[PDB]
Amino acid sequence: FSRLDKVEAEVQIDRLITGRLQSLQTYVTQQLIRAAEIRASANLAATKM
Amino acid sequence: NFNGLKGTGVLTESNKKFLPFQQFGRDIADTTDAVRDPQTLEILDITPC
Amino acid sequence: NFNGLKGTGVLTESNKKFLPFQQFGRDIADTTDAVRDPQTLEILDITPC
Amino acid sequence: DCTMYICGDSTECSNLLLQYGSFCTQLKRALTGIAVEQDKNTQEVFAQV
Amino acid sequence: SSSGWTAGAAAYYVGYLQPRTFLLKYNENGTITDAVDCALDPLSETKCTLKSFTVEKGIYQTSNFRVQPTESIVRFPNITNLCPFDEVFNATRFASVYAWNRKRISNCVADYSVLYNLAPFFTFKCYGVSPTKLNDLCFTN
Lengths: 49, 49, 49, 49, 141
Fold this sequence. Notes:
The structure is cut from a larger assembly and holds five copies of chain A.
Chain A: H1 6-48
């Protein structure tokens, strides 16, 4: 914002804002996968108890 | 704003020693968080609010 | 192409009531579903084919 | 924090992220289900007395 | 009779407008029947972040609080010198294109505003830097 005109800085920043947002999706999806195995491993412990 | 390094945060008193050619302190995020005021030789730590 | 509102579908009589101000009806899906004919104040009923 | 991990300390970027839609609020909901789950697994394995 | 009039009582109220996010409840007839404002109360915030008017007992999460800046401070090198710009732009003689001369410009403050005012400038299009932002960014070399 201190180095580029606002007319096409949106084009530049969009190539940076979609990568970060898509990066955040990978972490969220990985969290769902991991929390599914822990949940399946919690109900294995619950039966043991 | 230090030499065009615009951002929002706080300025505290730091203890890390900078080499004479070093002015930008980075971190794991690989973004600047420790600079030196051009008027003096003091090193300032920058952390977000 | 009501007043530039391009769309496609079949139009029937609509029992829904429009206030004299209101022009376009919108659904939960956030799209137009009823239009007021400029020549006839009767309210149409847009629905896809 | 979707609005700050992506466009922290940038008002215009936060405005630019606003028009991207219901994407940030989806993750706050998605990770909440994971967060509340970890208060159920331990509440199920250990709270059988 | 043009001076002095006996008129009746009258009362009027005036308010200003702010940009806000409002949750409006359209009824079955489509007229406004209920409305809430997000930025009024925490209860209003949790009402409008769930897109509902009645909320059940429980914990909820809402917008992240952040500390607004109180002031602004700008620090630039304390040196105050005029960069050798005009002499370059007002040089009597220029070298040949194949014999271009490179000059060192540093240890000075460069003002591009004076260059902006020169009438016969033709080519001014800056790619990596916004042309209007050359008066507030520090140049290494």
